[PDB]
Design an enzyme around this catalytic site. Structure first.
Site, PDB file in Angstrom:
ATOM      1  N   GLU A 143      26.978   5.767 -11.195  1.00 36.78           N
ATOM      2  CA  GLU A 143      27.851   6.474 -10.258  1.00 36.78           C
ATOM      3  C   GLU A 143      27.178   6.644  -8.901  1.00 36.78           C
ATOM      4  OE1 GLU A 143      27.272   7.590 -13.408  1.00 36.78           O
ATOM      5  OE2 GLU A 143      29.133   8.301 -14.330  1.00 36.78           O
ATOM      6  N   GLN A 193       0.822  -1.206   0.000  1.00 40.62           N
ATOM      7  CA  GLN A 193       0.000   0.000   0.000  1.00 40.62           C
ATOM      8  C   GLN A 193       0.858   1.258   0.000  1.00 40.62           C
ATOM      9  OE1 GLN A 193      -3.050   0.017   2.969  1.00 40.62           O
ATOM     10  NE2 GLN A 193      -3.955   1.937   2.241  1.00 40.62           N
ATOM     11  N   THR A 219       1.997   2.762  13.752  1.00 45.95           N
ATOM     12  CA  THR A 219       0.629   2.269  13.648  1.00 45.95           C
ATOM     13  C   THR A 219       0.473   0.861  14.211  1.00 45.95           C
ATOM     14  OG1 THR A 219       1.016   1.446  11.404  1.00 45.95           O
ATOM     15  CG2 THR A 219       0.266   3.717  11.636  1.00 45.95           C
ATOM     16  N   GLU A 262      -4.559  -7.062  -1.567  1.00 40.78           N
ATOM     17  CA  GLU A 262      -5.924  -6.580  -1.403  1.00 40.78           C
ATOM     18  C   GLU A 262      -6.305  -5.732  -2.604  1.00 40.78           C
ATOM     19  OE1 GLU A 262      -6.244  -3.422   1.662  1.00 40.78           O
ATOM     20  OE2 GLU A 262      -4.144  -3.882   2.109  1.00 40.78           O
ATOM     21  N   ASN A 288       8.460   8.340   8.763  1.00 34.98           N
ATOM     22  CA  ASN A 288       7.383   9.321   8.673  1.00 34.98           C
ATOM     23  C   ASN A 288       7.494  10.475   9.662  1.00 34.98           C
ATOM     24  OD1 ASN A 288       5.735   8.518   6.506  1.00 34.98           O
ATOM     25  ND2 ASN A 288       4.766   6.915   7.740  1.00 34.98           N
TER      26      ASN A 288
END
Ligand code: GTP
Ligand code: GDP
Ligand code: GDP
Ligand code: MG
EC number: 3.6.5.-
Lengths: 27, 97, 430, 110, 439, 430
Positions: free
Chosen positions: E254, E11, E179, E71, E206
């Site tokens: 490189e 996801q 989470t 899913e 995050n």
């Protein structure tokens, strides 16, 4: 006294337009 | 409601000068703000598509006058029962200060 | 090169700075959106002194706005010419000082000043060659009076060899708006005399008198007072930003005006000033300009020159004029008022000629005078201070935030020493 | 008692909200004679999108002298034959495009 | 002639690929329908789009991308979105049942029936390719199908192609804000898998990007789209050299000759500057020195990791816009002069610069403003071992009592996998510590 | 397409099923006649999860109606929305259970369960990609607690890999409605732990106090309790039916909430809940939602969650919100209440987001929690069981249907073992 004095003193009006103070040539 | 509609035309008139056409009105229409776009009820594409379809089958090049302008929005006021909802549409769409 | 940065604190300081920036932008031809649309080359010749060039070709002032209350900050942001300032330079607290010098100098100032000192350091390291600092504040308000002087102390600690200017509005007895005013006035003076290189004093009552008598305006306001102060302020750097026959800068003024290290409190004034009715009856000449300059009623201060003797004075002339006329006028006035001039320094007047007059006038004059009559203000302030301090009134606010009575005693002693040593040279004879 | 129904994807990019009756009929007329497949790229055309008309530097000309190249590269004992050639090439390409008609959103494509 | 293949699995990978493909389409002028709006002819002697898009001959172009997920939700919603006519219909591979945060499910039971089809699609998409340069893979490591399918695809690709380079843009869990609960297990297992089979890995957690958005853009209600847009900008700045001219062109080769001192050390973290809103851009200097200093400012990193706790091994910064080699060199010299940045002793020269003339593109309705200069930086440092250490702590603290192990073992996973992953992590941390010492 | 079937039995189970189907039909925009009259297209792409398909333009729910007596099914079919369920899906006896677990599980249940197994197998083979089962019933009664768990055992034997939810209305002794509740309660709890993958207990006393304290209505019937349970039921499977930023299904919830195979007893709740007088005076924000989310009196069970410690918890947010605030609020509520969360597991809260809020609401959240405090209910039920079984009260009714005391003893032992092994983690430190 409250019902006749405070409750019904105001109408839908008095709220409609409310604005207060905002923040040579010669020569 | 009449003077609010009339006042809306004047600001549109001064922006488009002497003449006003359907293309000019479409260009001047402020799709960005609207009453419902800020609430995320619909996208900008719905509102503009609805507006042009509601404006009839008239050619974009034809020019309308004050009487035609007032007659069109007389219907909009007729269907809209909320006076606050009618007010917010005109001010936001045509940048009424 | 030789540019200066501007920092302002307090409500009065912010108003002064806003009107000063409006005046400077009008004189340099910068629109409120920051785009250059001047009409002369000399307008853009030396724009680097007060402004910075960013991407896209717009100019932003190098001004740093400091405060503890966001009200006046939001007002000046929404007012005219409020878009010139960089949004980052706005630094403010969220509580306020409540006209308390202790609160503005020890509790919130100490914790807030880190960010404003960071931005000041950023500007000072960004400028090519720093000339000095100029600060606008008031000695009556707690937050300005405290945070400004603490920042002066820090800036002098970090940059020793530069010049520091302060345009301070000192308390007046007849026009009073605060009841704890003498306390923080004396506390500000004690710290200011130690570090500030120059100090310039303004009086609201003096401005009212000037605008009512000389200008004959029926309804003066803070806009007019700020306009007068801003014109008098720009008169100082006119000669630095424009060419002239005898150019002079801030260091030149300091050397030629300060005989002794602690005698650096000056009074200023501007000329010409005429009402609208008498606008066309006047003739603009050097003699009448000097007459209005030396007129006591034109001073921005309530101190009367006839109550003391001048140590040194300076006169910055703007416009095209002959040097012999200016020199002869200076010599003539010095000989005519010899009793009012100190006698152990000959020719105690400095004159400078600049070739660019203010926009709208063919000629103009700025006056900076160091006279012994300025002791009267300190005398009155100290009298009020001791009258209130003999009863320890309002003292618990200051004692409950880290201070004690020994600091007040030391400040009073320092002010009295300044007054006595400043009066000594008035009657000192050769 | 509303439904809302505007997912994060739709708010981010768009929601089509199209396909009237005659649009589908009109679009089908496009492939009356449209054929699947392709030929090959005729080679010697595959390259990177070139921007400068010079070599080893970005040819920028503006009123400000610090970024005019010709003003900056005037220290030479003579007039370099790269800038004038580039300007003449630009003018010639503009004229050639006018003769054919391309208006390709910038002069550099052709 | 030069092009890359992008793999989007999981996801997070799909939701990053969506934004990056939006950015690529806008950059190359391809409409969402896939059609260029004409006015790009005149024998068109340059295929700047060949790196990412391939033409079908008459009008539209198709991306060189593949989408994987077990899913059907995001895949079908993209199929029904505004980009329905862009992607090839049979390269949006979708499953039937979610993996449900289970590495064993993703790697042993339900991934086998999909990996063969995915490999066939990759082979078909690579046959018509002529100048293949490498792979770009985006996945989430703290997720079941993400980690499992990523591990399986890397393992199969490393034997079906071999010497071809592959670059990994993974998303490790943030230090504290996260989470899921059982994410350390499959994160450890996926790290075990990718260590040997990924040539260059980039950390994209995050919390750091949330901090960047809050501090720079002054936005207090961020979502995944903003993070995806930042990652898309990073990818575009990285791959601009393959499709635009510049003073110093740096190819994809490189990196595995310029940033990887040893085969076992290929984990690095990124940065980006300038990041400003649309209101404060006009009041800023935005100079080369300022943007380079902003890049090295430690709080501007795109991963939650303090570089001051470790040395620097090799940095490669790609400038785009109207930069100049003189002030690039001046800024680099000032960086070397400043003490607070410390390099490793055995690396006296530690910078590679690439310059491109294309200014960054701006998506409409976004947060970033229109700028003329930008820099994207990829830095290999020894301070990255802290994230491995904290993840190891989080793993063994709950593994001490065999929490959630029945879920993993009931699908066919042998118990020794956890032990061997732990030993390999310990070995990797030991190698970093030994390399970080002076000589 | 990961679609789930519904089985409801007993009086309470039938009522919950009817209310749940009413809520689902209203949310999806389905008429009582089975016709779609919605507005947006988001309501049709996932209609197959809960509704099968029939000729004639109508959708039929995939539910099985099952009981030993036809009274409650007569009532549900006579009531509104009774035309949706297929007449073939009604299975009923002619005798009843009479609050006897032995009668419901051994004699009549065994001979009746063949038809319901046949229809369940028919539906399961009709659906393509089965996702699992969800059961709603009661444990304090006869027919539900016996034959529903017999069916649970049979279905778990037949389909080992599929998942199995359960919404059991366990009886609270504060509001007691039967004299023989502990017996069949213990017998059903002993059988549930081997088979049911997820159990979510409910208390009528808890529902009553929630309605009185939060909703503030004087005379609540069973209808509003059923509506609350239906809202909690429909909040669980929001992400499986609508697009979102973090999709999460039943197996994800199980694998993320179950640390050990015998700790699959949860306790649920719903938010926001407000009285009708204060509907417009409360702001719908993530902080307010998460503050009411962890309130002890907002739980659907009589057990007090502040008397124990959470092992794991899950949050299924709905509506358009910010992942940053969601995650920050989760971290903050985990840090400020570190005493109530067990320490040997880090980040024991799972966040999930769905983009479609319920009709009439802007955002909503469902809380499912695995807490050590659920052991009080088992302890009190076991205490009642021991007190009544010491004297062998009412035991002849159970033993007259082939049931022996050995199974009673084994069930009591298993319940005590569950309590012991479930509370031994409260003080466990790694
Ligand atoms: N930054 C960012 N992270 C994302 C995004 N989408 C998913 N993630 C990360 O993915 C992690 C969980 O894995 P998911 O992507 O939700 O699920 P998955 O990887 O497909 O694995 P399954 O759950 O088995 O389907 C979360 O902790 C997120 O941090 C995204 O759009 N942006
Ligand atoms: N000249 C001038 N003086 C001002 C203005 N506003 C306030 N003052 C003076 O400032 C004094 C009060 O200072 P204050 O505002 O409390 O300073 P602060 O506490 O630092 O903000 C009063 O005596 C006023 O005379 C202004 O706009 N112009
Ligand atoms: N929430 C709710 N609970 C109910 C309802 N009807 C009965 N109950 C509960 O179910 C318990 C009795 O269970 P019962 O129906 O006799 O079980 P059965 O004989 O096996 O069907 C009582 O304690 C009630 O609290 C209902 O409509 N809603
Ligand atoms: Mg997934």
């Amino acid at each position: 006294v409250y019902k006749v004095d405070v409750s019904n003193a105001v109408q839908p009006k008095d709220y409609q337009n409310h604005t207060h103070v905002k923040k040579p040539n010669n020569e | 409601r009449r003077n609010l509609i009339n006042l809306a035309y004047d600001v549109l008139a001064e922006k488009l000068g002497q003449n006003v056409t359907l293309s000019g009105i479409f260009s001047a229409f402020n799709k960005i703000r609207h009453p419902d776009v800020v609430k995320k009820y619909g996208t900008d594409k719905e509102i503009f598509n609805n507006f042009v379809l509601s404006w009839g089958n008239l050619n974009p090049h034809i020019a309308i006058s004050r009487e035609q302008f007032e007659s069109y929005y007389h219907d909009f006021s007729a269907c809209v029962d909320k006076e606050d909802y009618f007010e917010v549409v005109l001010k936001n769409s045509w940048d009424i200060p | 090169m030789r540019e200066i940065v501007h920092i302002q604190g307090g409500q009065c300081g912010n108003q002064i700075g806003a009107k000063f920036w409006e005046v400077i932008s009008d004189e340099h031809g910068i629109d409120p959106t920051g785009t250059y649309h001047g009409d002369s080359d000399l307008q853009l010749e030396r724009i680097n002194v007060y402004y910075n060039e960013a991407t896209g070709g717009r100019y932003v002032p190098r001004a740093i706005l400091m405060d503890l209350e966001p009200g006046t900050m939001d007002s000046v942001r929404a007012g005219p010419f409020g878009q010139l300032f960089r949004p980052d330079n706005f630094v403010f607290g969220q509580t306020g000082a409540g006209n308390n010098w202790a609160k503005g100098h020890y509790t919130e100032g100490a914790e807030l000043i880190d960010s404003v000192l960071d931005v000041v350091r950023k500007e000072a390291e960004g400028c090519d060659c720093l000339q000095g600092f100029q600060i606008t504040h008031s000695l009556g308000g707690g937050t300005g009076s405290g945070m400004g002087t603490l920042l002066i102390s820090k800036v002098r600690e970090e940059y020793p060899d530069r010049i520091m200017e302060t345009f301070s509005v000192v308390p007046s007895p007849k026009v009073s708006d605060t009841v704890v005013e003498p306390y923080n006035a004396t506390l500000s003076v004690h710290q200011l005399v130690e570090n500030a290189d120059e100090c310039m004093v303004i009086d609201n009552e003096a401005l009212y008198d000037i605008c009512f008598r000389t200008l004959k305006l029926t309804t003066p306001t803070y806009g007019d007072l700020n306009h007068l102060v801003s014109a008098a302020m720009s008169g100082v750097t006119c000669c630095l930003r424009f060419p002239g026959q005898l150019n002079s800068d801030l260091r030149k003024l300091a050397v030629n005006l300060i005989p002794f290290p602690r005698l650096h409190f000056f009074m200023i004034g501007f000329a010409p000033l005429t009402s609208r009715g008498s606008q066309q009856y006047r003739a603009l000449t050097v003699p009448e300009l000097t007459q209005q300059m030396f007129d006591a009623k034109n001073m921005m201060c309530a101190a009367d020159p006839r109550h003391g003797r001048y140590l040194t004075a300076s006169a910055l002339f703007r416009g095209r004029m002959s040097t012999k006329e200016v020199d002869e006028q200076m010599l003539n006035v010095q000989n005519k008022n010899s009793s009012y001039f100190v006698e152990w320094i000959p020719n105690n007047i400095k004159s400078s000629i600049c070739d660019i007059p203010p926009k709208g006038l063919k000629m103009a004059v700025t006056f900076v005078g160091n006279s012994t009559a300025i002791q009267e203000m300190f005398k009155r302030v100290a009298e009020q201070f001791t009258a209130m301090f003999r009863r320890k009134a309002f003292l618990h606010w200051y004692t409950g935030e880290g201070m004690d009575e020994m600091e007040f005693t030391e400040a009073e002693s320092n002010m009295n020493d300044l007054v006595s040593e400043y009066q000594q040279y008035q009657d000192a004879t050769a | 008692e509303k439904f809302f129904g505007m997912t994060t994807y739709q708010q981010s990019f768009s929601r089509p909200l199209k396909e009237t009756a005659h649009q589908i009929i009109a679009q089908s007329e496009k492939k009356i004679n449209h054929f699947a497949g392709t030929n090959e790229r005729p080679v010697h055309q595959q390259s990177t999108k070139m921007t400068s008309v010079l070599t080893a530097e970005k040819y920028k000309n503006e009123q400000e002298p610090k970024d005019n190249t010709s003003i900056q590269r005037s220290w030479l004992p003579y007039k370099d034959k790269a800038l004038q050639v580039a300007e003449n090439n630009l003018i010639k390409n503009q004229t050639l495009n006018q003769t054919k008609g391309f208006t390709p959103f910038n002069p550099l494509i052709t | 002639m030069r092009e890359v293949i992008s793999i989007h699995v999981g996801q997070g990978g799909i939701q990053v690929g969506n934004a990056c493909w939006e950015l690529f389409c806008l950059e190359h002028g391809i409409q969402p329908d896939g059609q260029m709006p004409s006015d790009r002819t005149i024998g068109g002697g340059d295929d700047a789009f060949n790196t990412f898009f391939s033409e079908t001959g008459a009008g539209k172009h198709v991306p060189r991308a593949v989408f994987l997920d077990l899913e059907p939700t995001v895949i079908d919603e993209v199929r029904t979105g505004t980009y329905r006519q862009l992607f090839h219909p049979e390269q949006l591979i979708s499953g039937k049942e979610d993996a449900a945060n289970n590495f064993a499910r993703g790697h042993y039971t339900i991934g086998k029936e999909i990996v063969d089809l995915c490999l066939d699609r990759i082979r078909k998409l690579a046959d018509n390719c002529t100048g293949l340069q490498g792979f770009l893979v985006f996945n989430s490591v703290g997720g079941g199908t993400g980690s499992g399918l990523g591990s399986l695809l890397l393992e199969r690709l490393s034997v079906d192609y071999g010497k071809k380079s592959k670059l990994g843009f993974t998303i490790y869990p943030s230090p504290q804000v996260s989470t899921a609960v059982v994410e350390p297990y499959n994160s450890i297992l996926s790290t075990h898998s990718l260590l040997e089979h990924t040539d260059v890995a980039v950390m994209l957690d995050n919390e750091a990007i949330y901090d960047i958005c809050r501090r720079n853009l002054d936005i207090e209600r961020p979502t995944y789209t903003n993070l995806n847009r930042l990652i898309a900008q990073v990818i575009s700045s990285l791959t601009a050299s393959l499709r635009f001219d510049g003073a110093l062109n740096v190819d994809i080769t490189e990196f595995q000759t310029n940033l990887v001192p040893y085969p076992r050390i290929h984990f690095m973290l990124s940065s980006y500057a300038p990041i400003i809103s649309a209101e404060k851009a006009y009041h800023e200097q935005l100079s080369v020195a300022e943007i380079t200093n902003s890049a090295f400012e430690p709080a501007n990193m795109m991963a939650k990791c303090d570089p001051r706790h470790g040395k620097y091994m090799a940095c490669s910064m790609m400038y785009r816009g109207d930069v100049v080699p003189k002030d690039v060199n001046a800024s680099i010299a000032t960086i070397k002069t400043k003490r607070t940045i410390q390099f490793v002793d055995w690396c006296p020269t530690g910078f590679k610069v690439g310059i491109n003339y294309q200014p960054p593109t701006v998506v409409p309705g976004g947060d970033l403003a229109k700028v003329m200069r930008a820099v994207c930086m990829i830095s290999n440092s020894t301070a990255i071992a802290e994230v491995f250490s904290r993840l190891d702590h989080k793993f063994d603290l709950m593994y001490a009592k065999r929490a959630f192990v029945h879920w993993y073992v009931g699908e066919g996973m042998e118990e020794g996998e956890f032990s061997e992953a732990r030993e390999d992590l310990a070995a990797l941390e030991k190698d970093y510590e030994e390399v970080g010492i002076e000589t």
